[PDB]
């Protein structure tokens, strides 16, 4: 069995925009050079958060049919998925894109940025669970697209339009699971398990931001005003 020419086309358009994504060198150099203070470590994570927002929007814009949606629903989808997409991209950066030494330094910085263990521990737990799945680039790109095109996010006026965009991505991901892992019929179910685990980070994240409202060091108006 194989993907139909239309499914190959759809996957190609998703792979192309996903492969364009790159963590800039200036952020990488900072992980290596900057002071190990809570303020400097937090400033590095602020740079990573702002980079993710820019990368997420450029990726989403190139998703087949995204620009055909009503403008307000495009905003609602980006707002509702930004946090879940951050954890997915972060998992990939930590487990595949960053060299062993650089990731160990990034983890050191995260664990010393002034953020409570309550908001650090589930994050590293998720990275380990994702890494266990030995996910391909195709699976990372499709999951990211499925998370963004979730028709159940708040403040979407035309959910059916979004359903029509997400359903063919789920068919493609299941077909890729049946093609590349035929001896493991539960591989698709393992990928859906990551979707449900990602949703729990929204309440953890919102709780984390709400607690910074009486803090002068951690309060970042650019990201806080939206999320």
């Amino acid at each position: 069995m194989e993907l139909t020419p239309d499914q190959q086309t759809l996957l190609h358009f998703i792979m192309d925009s996903y492969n364009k994504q790159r963590m800039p060198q200036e952020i990488t150099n900072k992980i290596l050079k900057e002071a190990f203070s809570a303020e400097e470590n937090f400033l590095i994570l602020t740079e990573m958060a702002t980079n993710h927002v820019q990368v997420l929007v450029e990726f989403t814009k190139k998703l087949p049919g995204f620009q055909t949606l009503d403008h307000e629903d495009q905003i609602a989808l980006l707002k509702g998925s930004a946090v879940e997409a951050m954890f997915l991209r972060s998992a990939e950066i930590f487990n595949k894109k960053l060299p062993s030494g650089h990731s160990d330094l990034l983890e050191a910085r995260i664990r010393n940025s002034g953020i409570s263990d309550e908001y650090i521990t589930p994050m590293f737990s998720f990275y380990k669970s994702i890494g266990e799945l030995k996910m391909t680039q195709e699976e990372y790109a499709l999951l990211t697209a499925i998370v963004i095109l979730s028709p159940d996010r708040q403040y979407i006026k035309d959910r059916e339009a979004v359903e029509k965009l997400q359903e063919p991505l789920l068919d493609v991901l299941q077909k890729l699971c049946k093609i590349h892992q035929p001896e493991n019929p539960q591989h698709f179910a393992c990928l859906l398990g990551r979707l449900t685990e990602l949703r729990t980070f929204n309440h953890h994240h919102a709780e984390m931001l709400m607690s910074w409202r009486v803090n002068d060091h951690k309060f970042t108006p650019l990201l806080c005003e939206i999320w």
């Binding site: 927002v53 820019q54 929007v57 450029e58 814009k61 495009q74 905003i75 980006l78 707002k79 650019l222 939206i226």
Partner: peptide, 10 residues
């Protein structure tokens, strides 16, 4: 919404 609107409409 201003930042997202700008990045989306660029």
């Amino acid at each position: 919404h201003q930042l997202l609107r700008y990045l989306l409409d660029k």
